[PDB]
Amino acid sequence: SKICLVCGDEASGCHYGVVTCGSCKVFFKRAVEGQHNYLCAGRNDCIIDKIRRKNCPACRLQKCLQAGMNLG
Amino acid sequence: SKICLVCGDEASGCHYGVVTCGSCKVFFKRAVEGQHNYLCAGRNDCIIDKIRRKNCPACRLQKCLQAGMNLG
DNA sequence: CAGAACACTCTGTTCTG
DNA sequence: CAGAACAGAGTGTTCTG
Ligand SMILES: [Zn+2]
Ligand SMILES: [Zn+2]
Ligand SMILES: [Zn+2]
Ligand SMILES: [Zn+2]
């Protein structure tokens, strides 16, 4: 496939176990080892797409997890 | 109140008609004047508080207008 | 492919008449 | 008070093993 399983932007290959775009790749790496205080403002099922992926990083991260992205 | 009617943060007085913090004051004018494409990732009722006011500018603008802000 | 180093978005603060 | 404008976190792209 050529679409990111997380946001639907054009995929640049398989990153951390899942086919993702470059911004989802580094969002995930940064989420896992960084210092964020993400919090959903809706009901933990925000729509994650290219247009809205910056809106709820907390749902973005959860969607990354469910798709199976991992470091290990 | 010292409280912002849009986001609950400590308010710096009445701006464009409504008691607001400084961030919402300048968020509101930037929104209205420079219209661009804000879209809710939930169901257009995102909680707007200090921790989460960057998440959904569409709802943030929506709460601003309801609360009564304007430039006229 | 994983990471680094860059550049961008947008926001929020401080300063002013 | 409204507005100018600098500084910042968070994000995204380009590049370099
Ligand atoms: Zn993506
Ligand atoms: Zn969410
Ligand atoms: Zn506010
Ligand atoms: Zn919303």
Numbering used by the authors:
A (entry chain A), B (entry chain B): 600 to 671
Show the paper's wording.
Steroid hormones exert their effects by binding to steroid hormone receptors (SRs), which include the estrogen receptors as well as members of the NR3C subfamily (i.e. the mineralocorticoid, glucocorticoid, androgen, and progesterone receptors). MR responds to aldosterone, 11-deoxycorticosterone and cortisol, while GR is selective for cortisol only.
In this report, we determine the first crystal structure of the MR DBD in order to provide a framework for elucidating the subtle differences between the corticosteroid receptors and interpreting the biology of disease-associated mutations. We then crystallized the MR – GRE complex, obtaining small crystals that anisotropically diffracted to 2.4 Å. As expected, the structure is very similar to structure of GR DBD – GRE complexes (r.m.s.d. <1.0 Å). Inspection of the MR – DNA interface reveals three amino acids that make sequence-specific contacts with GRE bases. The terminal nitrogen of lysine 624 forms a hydrogen bond with the N7 position of guanine 3. In GR, the side chain of histidine 453 can assume a “flipped” conformation, where it occupies a position between the DNA and the reading helix. This conformation can also be seen, with minor variations, in the crystal structure of MR bound to a GRE. The MR – GRE structure reveals that the MR dimer perturbs DNA in a very similar manner as a GR dimer.
